[PDB]
Amino acid sequence: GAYKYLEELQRKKQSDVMRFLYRVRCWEYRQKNVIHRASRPSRPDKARRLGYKAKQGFVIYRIRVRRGGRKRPVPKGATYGKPTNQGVNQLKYQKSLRSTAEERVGRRASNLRVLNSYWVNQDSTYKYFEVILVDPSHKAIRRDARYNWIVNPVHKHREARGLTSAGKKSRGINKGHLFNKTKAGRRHTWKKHNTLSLWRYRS
Amino acid sequence: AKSGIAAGVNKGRKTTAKEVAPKISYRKGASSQRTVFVRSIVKEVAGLAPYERRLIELIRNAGEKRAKKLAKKRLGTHKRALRKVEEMTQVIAESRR
Amino acid sequence: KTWRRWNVKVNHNEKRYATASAIAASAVTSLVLARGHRVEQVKELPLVVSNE
Amino acid sequence: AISKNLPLLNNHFRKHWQERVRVHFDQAGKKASRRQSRLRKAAKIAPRPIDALRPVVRAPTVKYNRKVRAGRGFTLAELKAVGIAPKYARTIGISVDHRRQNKSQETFDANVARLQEYKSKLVIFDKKTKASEVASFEQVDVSATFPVEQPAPESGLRAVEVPEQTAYRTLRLARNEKKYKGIREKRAKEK
Amino acid sequence: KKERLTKEAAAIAEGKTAKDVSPKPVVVKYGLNHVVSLIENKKAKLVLIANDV
Amino acid sequence: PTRLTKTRKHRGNVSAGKGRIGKHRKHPGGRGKAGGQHHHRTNLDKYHPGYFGKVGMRYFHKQQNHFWRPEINLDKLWTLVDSEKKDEYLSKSSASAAPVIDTLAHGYGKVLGKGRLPEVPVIVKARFVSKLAEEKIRAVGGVVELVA
RNA sequence: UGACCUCAAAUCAGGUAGGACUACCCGCUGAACUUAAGCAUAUCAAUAAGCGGAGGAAAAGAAACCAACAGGGAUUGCCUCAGUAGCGGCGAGUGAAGCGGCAAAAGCUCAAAUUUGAAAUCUGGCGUCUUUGGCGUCCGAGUUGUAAUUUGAAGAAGGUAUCU
RNA sequence: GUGUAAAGUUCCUUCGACGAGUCGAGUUGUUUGGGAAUGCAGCUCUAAGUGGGUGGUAAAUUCCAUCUAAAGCUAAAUAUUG
Numbered sequence A: 001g002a003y004k005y006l007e008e009l010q011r012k013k014q015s016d017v018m019r020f021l022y023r024v025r026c027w028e029y030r031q032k033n034v035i036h037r038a039s040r041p042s043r044p045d046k047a048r049r050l051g052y053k054a055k056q057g058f059v060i061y062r063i064r065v066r067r068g069g070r071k072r073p074v075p076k077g078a079t080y081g082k083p084t085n086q087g088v089n090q091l092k093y094q095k096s097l098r099s100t101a102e103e104r105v106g107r108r109a110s111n112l113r114v115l116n117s118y119w120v121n122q123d124s125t126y127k128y129f130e131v132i133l134v135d136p137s138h139k140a141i142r143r144d145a146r147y148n149w150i151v152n153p154v155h156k157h158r159e160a161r162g163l164t165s166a167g168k169k170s171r172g173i174n175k176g177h178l179f180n181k182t183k184a185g186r187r188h189t190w191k192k193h194n195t196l197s198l199w200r201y202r203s
Numbered sequence B: 001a002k003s004g005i006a007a008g009v010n011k012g013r014k015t016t017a018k019e020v021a022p023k024i025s026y027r028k029g030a031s032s033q034r035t036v037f038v039r040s041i042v043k044e045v046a047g048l049a050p051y052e053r054r055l056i057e058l059i060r061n062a063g064e065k066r067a068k069k070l071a072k073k074r075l076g077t078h079k080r081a082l083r084k085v086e087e088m089t090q091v092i093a094e095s096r097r
Numbered sequence C: 001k002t003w004r005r006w007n008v009k010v011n012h013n014e015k016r017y018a019t020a021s022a023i024a025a026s027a028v029t030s031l032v033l034a035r036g037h038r039v040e041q042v043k044e045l046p047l048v049v050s051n052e
Numbered sequence D: 001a002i003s004k005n006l007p008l009l010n011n012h013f014r015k016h017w018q019e020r021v022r023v024h025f026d027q028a029g030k031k032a033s034r035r036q037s038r039l040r041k042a043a044k045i046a047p048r049p050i051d052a053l054r055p056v057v058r059a060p061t062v063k064y065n066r067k068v069r070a071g072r073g074f075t076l077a078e079l080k081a082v083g084i085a086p087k088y089a090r091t092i093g094i095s096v097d098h099r100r101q102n103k104s105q106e107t108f109d110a111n112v113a114r115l116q117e118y119k120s121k122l123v124i125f126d127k128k129t130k131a132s133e134v135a136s137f138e139q140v141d142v143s144a145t146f147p148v149e150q151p152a153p154e155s156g157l158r159a160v161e162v163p164e165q166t167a168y169r170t171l172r173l174a175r176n177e178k179k180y181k182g183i184r185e186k187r188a189k190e191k
Numbered sequence E: 001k002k003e004r005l006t007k008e009a010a011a012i013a014e015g016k017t018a019k020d021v022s023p024k025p026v027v028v029k030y031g032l033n034h035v036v037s038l039i040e041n042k043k044a045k046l047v048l049i050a051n052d053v
Numbered sequence F: 001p002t003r004l005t006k007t008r009k010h011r012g013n014v015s016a017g018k019g020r021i022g023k024h025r026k027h028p029g030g031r032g033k034a035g036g037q038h039h040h041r042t043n044l045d046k047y048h049p050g051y052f053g054k055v056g057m058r059y060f061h062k063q064q065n066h067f068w069r070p071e072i073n074l075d076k077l078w079t080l081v082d083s084e085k086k087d088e089y090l091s092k093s094s095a096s097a098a099p100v101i102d103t104l105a106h107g108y109g110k111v112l113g114k115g116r117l118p119e120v121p122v123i124v125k126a127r128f129v130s131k132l133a134e135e136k137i138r139a140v141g142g143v144v145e146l147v148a
Numbered sequence G: 001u002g003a004c005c006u007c008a009a010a011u012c013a014g015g016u017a018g019g020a021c022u023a024c025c026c027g028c029u030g031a032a033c034u035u036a037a038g039c040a041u042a043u044c045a046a047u048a049a050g051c052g053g054a055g056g057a058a059a060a061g062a063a064a065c066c067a068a069c070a071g072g073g074a075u076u077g078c079c080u081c082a083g084u085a086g087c088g089g090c091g092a093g094u095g096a097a098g099c100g101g102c103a104a105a106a107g108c109u110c111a112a113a114u115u116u117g118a119a120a121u122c123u124g125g126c127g128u129c130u131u132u133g134g135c136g137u138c139c140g141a142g143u144u145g146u147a148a149u150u151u152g153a154a155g156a157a158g159g160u161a162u163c164u
Numbered sequence H: 001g002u003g004u005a006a007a008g009u010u011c012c013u014u015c016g017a018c019g020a021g022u023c024g025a026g027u028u029g030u031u032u033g034g035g036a037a038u039g040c041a042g043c044u045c046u047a048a049g050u051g052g053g054u055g056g057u058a059a060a061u062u063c064c065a066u067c068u069a070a071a072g073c074u075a076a077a078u079a080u081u082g
């Protein structure tokens, strides 16, 4: 079908065609509201890859998030501590702009569950993301055996808890030796390695 | 298959080898007719990137060493730079007819 | 604090040593009497009764 | 702060350690409740055994090559060799592992014999089966009925055969060949 | 389609295969994936592409 | 028990055994290993020489399983023979039929050569042997069979 | 005279979110007292305070894993590895992981495929019934793709001996 | 029970789609036991198809081993000053 072609063409982002389309769509998205509803995915193939289905109860929001690092929000740059903590500029947020996009969209549409999200476009001031959300109160979702799971309350604001793909990426939830500190949760691992376990018959 | 002793080249205990059926996951890098066809049409529709055109100019101007240095500066690694320069030489050979 | 030490380890063999010593002491009439048991009308120790 | 001839210690107690002290007062309670869970799970599904049959695999590393232990599941080749599909095997108390393979014949044969032994003792009930036959069976412990058994070390009498080259010399020559293999091959190629 | 299915259910009542009562359809193919696969399989004789996709 | 401690005996005496001049204080001298190069040098130099400095090369990601090789000597080698058959083997052992001692299956990596063997042929299976251990095994008419 | 796309309005039909609790849980943000007998890197500590989000557990989870063996085989926890490899004004300090024994064990789902001899899919209104729903019908969603079919351990399409 | 249905099983042939501003690279900050750089994040560059990742000393050359990322669900063993 056409989804393979769509996939292969979106990988040629520096071709003339894709550059023209990105210019035009960046202008239009910058001309709209920071958060707005998208009538449809601008990348149907990418949405399909990320779990979107053209059903009632699947929703798309486009959101615009400011680029760059995280300036320390201390008044006049005074940190009141030791010189190792005096940095104000060149500091970085530990979450991605994709995660920030997801969280702001989920906050705006608080009745939906954030399924996933993807990058759509970019300029010097903003990155643009499209967030795939699912309505858990819609019967087309509740009677769907492949999407009942997100109706259960342990998935309330999963994007706020880092349970989406972007969130698990920023949390370091991967297998292997390169993720020793964060495999099962960084703070959980630290607490486990800093707990004194004492038994009845001390060994 | 092993030397039967604990030191040297090919050390370890001898066992009777059993032929292993290859896993289908090991075919991941193989190409298919579907992806070759789709990629050829997408190359025709999309065209070339600016750095790929610059690479082609260096190769045409006999700057193989320059084209390698550019392809590594752009793509990031020497292995990928080697494959990109080989692909752009094959592109020139497919553009000379 | 609750992480005070409450249980104490004893070597299993030494614990068995003491068990054997106590079993042996149960057959000494003077020890049972000093222990305080009213055993003066038992004809011999150990006292063994039928399986009924 | 440092005094006398004493060992130098590493007592890592400079954080708020007292907020993370786990004292296992509930060791006996957890033992008892663990036993009750184990009894309830067994009685729910009796006479079906509570444990799936596990394979026998060699332990990794040069330190545990000698030992052999229970694996995770029988390979697809092993189940193929005993004519059981993995989907069916998971429903008759056999564990499957799609990840393990059989490079060598010894572990493969051991696990095939183990599967055939379990299959000979298996009795699969059906609709026609009555409660008299079901009650004629006792819930066995599969982990003890088909235990993992270490191969016996070679012992007893055998003829002495002394090679001309000593074992120490053999090891030294193997080490030397491995150490200089690359440079000798480069020298021969250049020559 | 409802009328055709009614006829086919009548034919299966008569004992027929329901494929003989209905002629082979000659219709317009649509759907982007479907039409792309038809072109790749050299089955499409003519393709009309919308200009405002 | 607290009733056996000297805290019970210091009750009634002003300083609790800490002195009237010294006056048991919080941390005179510092905490832990403080001042090891300055005012505890006289202690560390005397009792822990070699404490400061680097020696040798680092080894990133050292897996100790690689270096597993427990030693068994020759004077302890016959303890791996079955106890119920040791005396029979020590008597009836010959070149035609000598006991096999699998040291790896008993948990040993290298056979070392301390001590003396019974003048009795044995077949020793080892991953590694020392030169003198194998010379002594061959001298009693035995052999070392390398395994892996 | 009508479609379509995008965007609005309604006290339109029906829903949903907010707020609370604190012991555990998932993240963000984030000190300094303190230790170094001073002190700035370091330490305290990836801690306190601050902010966002859950559940009865949470999180993790069926390998882009560990290894280097004769190989293991999702995740989690315990015992051990180990105060070790390593990090550190290589100072004060700090510091995991593989293997091994055990507790518990459970596996899987999409996207990428032409149903193309038939959108076979689904929310809602209306009617009715035996009502956590079934049946009928009509709009709507949907071809810029809803069902069936496949998930790499495979699998598909043809042929194939038939069996369970 | 509408079981000419659904599913599995053997063999042969032809195939076998497998996730992109992502991997990866540089640099900056932070963090880590991770040390010519463990993870995370910002910015710049930006892929491929037996390709890609990992193999704890940076690099090129040659092999080998092992998985298959950039999409998703899942009880139990675990925690619990409420």
Ligand SMILES: CC[C@H]1CN2CCc3cc(OC)c(OC)cc3[C@@H]2C[C@@H]1C[C@H]1NCCc2cc(O)c(OC)cc21
Pocket (backbone or CB within 6 Å): G021
């Ligand atoms: C002093 C103890 C209180 C406070 N704490 C702590 C916080 C808390 C939070 C809760 O939810 C977050 C919660 O939910 C149940 C309960 C509590 C309890 C309630 C408890 C009173 C309650 N004890 C049981 C019986 C009873 C009977 C009454 O008539 C009655 O009158 C008010 C009250 C009660």
Ligand SMILES: [NH3+]CCC[NH2+]CCCC[NH2+]CCC[NH3+]
Pocket (backbone or CB within 6 Å): G045, G046
């Ligand atoms: N853990 C809380 C303190 C954070 N201080 C960061 C540690 C700095 C040391 N870096 C180690 C040197 C880099 N290899």
Ligand SMILES: [Mg+2]
Pocket (backbone or CB within 6 Å): none
């Ligand atoms: Mg650009």
Ligand SMILES: [Mg+2]
Pocket (backbone or CB within 6 Å): A056
């Ligand atoms: Mg809609």
Ligand SMILES: [Mg+2]
Pocket (backbone or CB within 6 Å): A066, A067, A068, A069, A070, A071
């Ligand atoms: Mg900012």
Ligand SMILES: [Mg+2]
Pocket (backbone or CB within 6 Å): A079, A080, A081, G031
């Ligand atoms: Mg401060």
Ligand SMILES: [Mg+2]
Pocket (backbone or CB within 6 Å): none
């Ligand atoms: Mg999860």
Ligand SMILES: [Mg+2]
Pocket (backbone or CB within 6 Å): B025, B026, B027, B028, B029, H050
């Ligand atoms: Mg491969």
Ligand SMILES: [Mg+2]
Pocket (backbone or CB within 6 Å): F016, F017, F018
């Ligand atoms: Mg005193």
Ligand SMILES: [Mg+2]
Pocket (backbone or CB within 6 Å): F015, F019, F020, F023
């Ligand atoms: Mg005084």
Ligand SMILES: [Mg+2]
Pocket (backbone or CB within 6 Å): F022, F023, F024, F025, F028
């Ligand atoms: Mg004093």
Ligand SMILES: [Mg+2]
Pocket (backbone or CB within 6 Å): F038
């Ligand atoms: Mg001085």
Ligand SMILES: [Mg+2]
Pocket (backbone or CB within 6 Å): G012
């Ligand atoms: Mg209303």
Ligand SMILES: [Mg+2]
Pocket (backbone or CB within 6 Å): G034
């Ligand atoms: Mg303090």
Ligand SMILES: [Mg+2]
Pocket (backbone or CB within 6 Å): G036
């Ligand atoms: Mg100080």
Ligand SMILES: [Mg+2]
Pocket (backbone or CB within 6 Å): G037
């Ligand atoms: Mg002081």
